[PDB]
Amino acid sequence: QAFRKFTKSERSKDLIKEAILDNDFMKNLELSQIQEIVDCMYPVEYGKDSCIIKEGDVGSLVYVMEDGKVEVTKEGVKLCTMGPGKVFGELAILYNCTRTATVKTLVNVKLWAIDRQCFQTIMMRTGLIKHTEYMEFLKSVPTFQSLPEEILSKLADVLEETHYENGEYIIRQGARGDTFFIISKGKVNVTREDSPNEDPVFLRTLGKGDWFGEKALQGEDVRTANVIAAEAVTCLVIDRDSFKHLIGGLDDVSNKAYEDAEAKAKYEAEAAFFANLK
Amino acid sequence: QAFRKFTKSERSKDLIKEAILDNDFMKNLELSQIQEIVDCMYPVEYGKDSCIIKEGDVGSLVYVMEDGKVEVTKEGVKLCTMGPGKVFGELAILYNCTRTATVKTLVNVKLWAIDRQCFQTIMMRTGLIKHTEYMEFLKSVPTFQSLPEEILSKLADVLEETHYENGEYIIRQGARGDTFFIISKGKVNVTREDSPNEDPVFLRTLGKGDWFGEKALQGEDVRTANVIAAEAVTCLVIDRDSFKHLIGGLDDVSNKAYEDAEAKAKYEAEAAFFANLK
Numbered sequence: 001q002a003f004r005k006f007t008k009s010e011r012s013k014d015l016i017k018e019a020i021l022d023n024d025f026m027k028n029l030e031l032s033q034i035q036e037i038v039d040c041m042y043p044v045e046y047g048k049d050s051c052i053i054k055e056g057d058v059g060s061l062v063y064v065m066e067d068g069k070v071e072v073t074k075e076g077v078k079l080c081t082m083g084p085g086k087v088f089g090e091l092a093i094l095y096n097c098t099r100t101a102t103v104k105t106l107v108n109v110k111l112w113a114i115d116r117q118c119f120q121t122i123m124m125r126t127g128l129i130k131h132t133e134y135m136e137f138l139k140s141v142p143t144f145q146s147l148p149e150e151i152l153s154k155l156a157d158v159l160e161e162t163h164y165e166n167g168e169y170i171i172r173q174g175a176r177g178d179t180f181f182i183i184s185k186g187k188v189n190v191t192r193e194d195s196p197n198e199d200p201v202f203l204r205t206l207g208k209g210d211w212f213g214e215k216a217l218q219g220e221d222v223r224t225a226n227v228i229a230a231e232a233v234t235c236l237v238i239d240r241d242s243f244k245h246l247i248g249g250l251d252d253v254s255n256k257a258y259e260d261a262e263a264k265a266k267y268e269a270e271a272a273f274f275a276n277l278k
Numbered sequence: 279q280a281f282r283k284f285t286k287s288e289r290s291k292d293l294i295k296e297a298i299l300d301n302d303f304m305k306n307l308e309l310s311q312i313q314e315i316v317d318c319m320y321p322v323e324y325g326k327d328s329c330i331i332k333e334g335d336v337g338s339l340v341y342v343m344e345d346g347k348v349e350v351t352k353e354g355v356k357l358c359t360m361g362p363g364k365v366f367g368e369l370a371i372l373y374n375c376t377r378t379a380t381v382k383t384l385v386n387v388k389l390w391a392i393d394r395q396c397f398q399t400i401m402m403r404t405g406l407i408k409h410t411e412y413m414e415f416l417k418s419v420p421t422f423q424s425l426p427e428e429i430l431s432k433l434a435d436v437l438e439e440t441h442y443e444n445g446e447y448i449i450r451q452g453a454r455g456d457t458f459f460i461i462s463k464g465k466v467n468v469t470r471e472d473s474p475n476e477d478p479v480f481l482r483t484l485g486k487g488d489w490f491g492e493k494a495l496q497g498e499d500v501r502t503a504n505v506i507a508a509e510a511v512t513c514l515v516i517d518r519d520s521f522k523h524l525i526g527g528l529d530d531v532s533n534k535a536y537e538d539a540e541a542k543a544k545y546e547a548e549a550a551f552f553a554n555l556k
């Protein structure tokens with residue numbers, strides 16, 4: 001399914017969009033999401049001296065002022081007035097829907113609104129978009145393309161995107177590591193120092209699609225070589241424990257697979273029975 | 279189940295017994311079973327020359343007379359009388375057919391009754407009772423005591439109790455067996471015909487708790503030795519195909535099958551990951 005779009009003027013569309021990009025909470029949303037919210041919102045008007053949001057209320061609507069002026073007050077304390085181009089009523093959505101302040105109108109106003117559902121949903125599409133971009137990325141790299149679909153997709157739901165600047169060491173020869181890295185952007189150099197005062201030896205170079213620190217996923221072990229960024233570098237990463245988890249979460253028994261075990265079992269039970277006798 | 283006890287006169291309580299002991303379908307019940315029957319029976323004094331059961335009726339009650347006389351007529355043809363004893367009306371309940379005869383009284387009677395359900399239950403209690411006995415018996419033999427509870431209980435639902443007499447061949451060498459025997463009473467001698475026209479060689483004696491003929495459960499076609507009862511013998515018996523059917527449906531076998539399956543899945547998945555790197 002999908003949501004009911006309310007076709008509006010480009011003027012209003014642009015306005016709604018600026019107000020969002022100007023809101024502490026929503027300025028982070030992905031374009032696709034912002035355009036969605038922009039299309040979901042419908043017009044709402046309130047007369048002068050009308051209470052729109054009352055603190056304590058359990059609310060669902062998020063608004064965008066288009067015209068008029070409102071006044072925000074909390075526990076009786078006037079906080080500010082707001083005019084066109086401002087978002088309000090978005091905060092309750094991340095406090096279990098309990099309004100944190102009162103919003104009364106000073107003149108007749110014209111708002112653009114969206115309900116809790118269209119809102120909470122749209123917001124939710126954040127993890128989905130990530131998974132997509134990640135999946136898209138993983139499937140562009142030969143090695144990870146070959147991986148079965150269950151892990152590849154479950155890997156994409158927990159991976160974190162950490163960053164590095166030219167010159168920073170990502171991992172060092174001799175450290176107690178537990179993080180696996182997949183280069184999504186940049187390039188790095190791997191070096192290892194022979195043993196004593198032997199200047200660091202250059203081993204290989206990795207870049208987009210390459211990876212390193214695999215061993216950390218297979219129990220406690222010290223790194224065999226250093227890995228330093230050789231320019232701006234981005235890495236999708238996952239720590240050992242989280243991995244062990246992902247793996248121990250591959251709840252995917254195949255139809256025929258359960259059948260074969262369904263068989264293996266019977267055989268054993270019978271043989272086990274006769275065993276117990278003589 | 280827990281039913282109601284219509285406490286009658288000690289005279290009457292000891293009156294029904296005889297009537298029950300006189301029935302082909304009830305002269306086998308356990309002391310307890312009878313006790314109950316006598317207990318849930320309730321007084322149903324009827325009028326003189328009154329009717330009770332009509333051929334074609336759908337049964338629901340079973341009775342035993344106490345102080346009356348009736349005519350178990352039928353096609354109008356007085357097919358006999360019946361005094362304060364003989365149990366009647368049971369036949370319809372057991373075959374669930376339709377009243378066969380058409381009883382009618384001959385004077386102010388004083389018969390007793392019990393509904394289709396209290397009777398139905400008490401009767402079938404023979405099954406649960408034997409299960410228990412069988413269950414108890416197996417648990418008192420170490421080699422079967424160690425078996426899981428599901429197997430012992432399924433086993434008690436199918437095992438049959440059979441008897442032989444001093445000197446009888448239970449198993450004859452070279453025959454085709456389909457049964458496995460567990461000795462619950464007596465002793466047996468196991469001999470083996472070594473070569474033709476030769477004195478069968480003694481192998482061993484088995485007693486309460488021991489067992490013989492397991493091979494048959496594995497499909498062995500021909501028995502390799504004679505098994506002669508050395509005195510009165512009672513055995514619990516089960517046939518190959520019933521055994522194999524039993525085993526194959528154990529819930530403790532499917533649960534251990536799925537787990538073994540989900541564990542291979544998690545393993546296979548991990549190795550697939552590290553096999554993909556290099």
Ligand SMILES: Nc1ncnc2c1ncn2[C@@H]1O[C@@H]2COP(=O)(O)O[C@H]2[C@H]1O
Nearest residue numbers: 053072079088089090091092099100101
């Ligand atoms: N200073 C402020 N304190 C609290 N809420 C404010 C303030 N300025 C604007 N608001 C808005 O007022 C809204 C009242 O309801 P919400 O808690 O849903 O969301 C709140 C914000 O969007």
Ligand SMILES: Nc1ncnc2c1ncn2[C@@H]1O[C@@H]2COP(=O)(O)O[C@H]2[C@H]1O
Nearest residue numbers: 350365366367368369370377378379380
């Ligand atoms: N000779 C008889 N033939 C048939 N039923 C009889 C006879 N004598 C007694 N009865 C009882 O009368 C009952 C009539 O109905 P039912 O078939 O339920 O069960 C029958 C027996 O319990």
